[PDB]
């Protein structure tokens, strides 16, 4: 099927990405984990407690039975608020990766596709080679059959042929694995897939890396992912800087306290005191806590987070040149890829007229037919080689589109569009 | 020596594996950790306090002389139970991970093994290459000695030769290399291993992938490791589901309270109250703790695990198609691997008579001896390439077994079967 | 320019390294964290409570007006002491990790360095290739212009040429590539670096592995990093051994207790008791806490660490043979590396006269000029390959130094010594 359909099936059917999607979600969910702390704290304990003294305190004993409701709010404590934005930035960062992931599958989506095609391509080529080398070896036999050759002559082409199987075999295997690569990502055995339409494929001189480089710099996701990551730890700078902060928290609870004395010193005058332990109480208010001196723990930590931010600060640079280098990297790849095709494109023509060289050389019976097959084999090679390049240039686009981050399902269609007629994977 | 012991040796001597076995064993301890808390917690503590009022509460003073014994138990908490099953799965996965290293170790031991043969193998080749290529260079000078060549023939011929030298040493390097590969996992200098025996060696047709794939699916351990990985995540959601329940736990304490008052408000008539009095007490019972509202934290927690499982849920599918892939991965390999030998095996035959063609042609002297060296050396290359594929098929054999999960120390034996007579690595 | 500064530059400008230095520095802070707790913990807190009975305890009411100061110290806990040494080792390892990046950075700076030379190198080659291969194609048409060729010669020849173009651009690509490789670590556009000087360049025989291996064993830092890694785990068991001991800690508090009763049971004759009292108090002393039974948790904990150390214990052996391997890894490399140059160095000589053979043959015109271009370009390939091995030996030099751990900014200097006269990367 065409790449977009190839894609759409995969973009849903792709489990890796699909894992990203979830892995994306749990993040944004964690935001909830983030805020709930900013929520009041509601809960219920209960305890069955019996005090029994074994000493002078003996005889003074009771069943302590109690029920209490409790809620506390975090009065003063921005570190949570800090930590809040942290997961906020986590979400943003974690958000980043998924965005990467789309292109990733996007990227990989095209890859295996045309790979299948390449295997589709090779699978096409090598057979013709076998279609030839068999012949060559074939009549060599009948040269030995005619005795016009010796057995090494006999033998060499024999293996020389069998090496073809040694090729074609692996080819189809590659054919199949071409399948699985796509079925893996996609999840379906795909009989056919769109070949590359040659007349409608224009070699396209790409953009200046200067802008694109700056383009993805606003864009490129890992570089994006780091930047927020640099942004992320930035708060980590200020999370442990929230250890400095004192805390104040809402203190709210209620419940019944029910006691009955027991044992010896439960026995007495009671003085309007000794009675059945039964009541309930209410305690409402705040809890403020200001750390004064912890031993520099919060101090050392800040630097820790601080010096983290440095390496964090590092990673931007470590990332930026990379994304930088990544930029021209893809850039120089496509152009080189541009060059190759124009070479092999020439090359195809080479074999082309070269291939003709057989026919009008064969139809005049000057040169043999197997040779035609030989050259017949050859043309497909560039048609192999060329095709491969024809995929690469398309390949590099996404990588660029990828590295740019500009890569989108529009960068996919431009692939899919030049995809015009399908070819099956079916080895015959 | 023999791959079996060679395996068997490093099977023990393998630090990785041994690390694994322990590392596996390490986890299986952790299960204990999980259950531990569900035991009573018996503990003891001591505190020396002195309370001095600095205000109207001044003169309210005593030695705080106190100690007590404390035990604690968990009555109702499922999360601990959750924790209980969790590490069970962790061990469940961890346990799985271990076997992975068997085939892992198993795979390697065979893996690095034949490389010795290869390194041995090629080394055999390249040596004769020098024997061939040198004598050529050897004769070439004889021409320049007869003037029959110029130096250009000579320098290149010499150069032609030297590359041979360049070639060979690396082998011996690789020789040791391939040797050390084994020593690495194994750890013992090995003079000679039993190489493949062309007599026993049998190219062998495997089972249907559709059958194989299922089998490993019951077998392949990473995939197994995957399901438990997923299965592992199963708990976690249920773990995250365990913030709901209240917690009931066993509350027990005993110890002495020894009170000596002090200061002005300790002084007086004492009101039949104030006086260095010293006691000890017991508190035993349950802690029921029912969460009410954490802010849906437990709630958002779950979804976290929820997606968390699903993103894991991907891995199954993610790994399954891949393990499906791997299923089709090597199953192709071996077959194409099969095609390999059949080519070179013929190809050997090709060179075989090719050699023979030489010797006779040299025997009758119609041709030089250098050619025989050429071909003779030439023969080895196939015989060289031969051993490789001979191993590679064998190599892919286990990989399938690994991928299948069918791999075992019996599958080692299968390899261990076609190895007849060892030969050293010592370069002569 | 010069590798030294080139190194020296990125040695600072290297974000990775700099990350490391900080990252190293980051840990060394954490040591502070470890010691911090063993300091007194000075702290302050405030709570506003109001207690209202809703039952017979109703009318039992007051403003809870309270605040206090609190400091805390650890008297006897070794685990903290354990914690103390732990991060010490962590720093101990972390400290080790840092140097790794020196050689790391050191290795790279040299590493990516000569690639510039290579990229420079090959680029020099391929250019002449075009000069050769074009003129060929150039003359070929002249034949087709004379009819002396058909187009098949032509197209292929043209095709033959175009591949050259395909070839070269990648170099320049790689040119920038190799350039950016350096800028990545370094970060500055570099016109020209000093290339290898065939005059100073000396193939040099190393020390005995048996001697070298030991040396790195005192040196190679990952292995060093390993032992501390093991050494690190040493504590942890002992850490896990520290759940045994009781814990004695300094218990100190001061603050005001300001009590204003309220409600019905606040009202009355007060019994010389009920009233708007307000106080402040001091509590100082020790916390002795002796664990008794956690369920063997401490016990099972240890074994965890116990095996944990051993599985780590593997790494030593695991890494040791490997570092042993690495010892034999490159030590072979360099030597085989040596063999490399000796071949190509001759090989250069082979092409050398080979060129010369051409020029004379062209000088006398016995042959075309294209050949000279062919050979002339041909010469570069050796001269091309030459520079590589020339670097590779040099390259392996440091790797050994790294593997040895002997690698340093002096070893950079050794490389920095054979670099005579820089040359730009700018493709002309």
Numbering used by the authors:
A (entry chain A), B (entry chain B), C (entry chain C): 1 to 428
Give verbatim excerpts from the published study on this entry:
A small peptide, AcrZ, has been identified that modifies the activity of AcrB. In this study, we report the near-atomic resolution cryoEM structures of the AcrAB-TolC pump captured in both resting and drug transport states.
We explored how the full pump accommodates AcrB in this functional state in the presence of puromycin, which is a validated transport substrate. This spatial disposition fits very well to the crystal structures of numerous other drug-bound AcrB structures. Though the AcrB subunit densities match well with those in the crystal structure, no puromycin density is detected in the cryoEM map. TolC adopts a fully opened state via tip-to-tip interactions with AcrA in the pump assembly and AcrAs pack tightly to form a sealed channel, which is similar to that seen in the complex of the pump with the potent inhibitor MBX3132, to which we now turn.
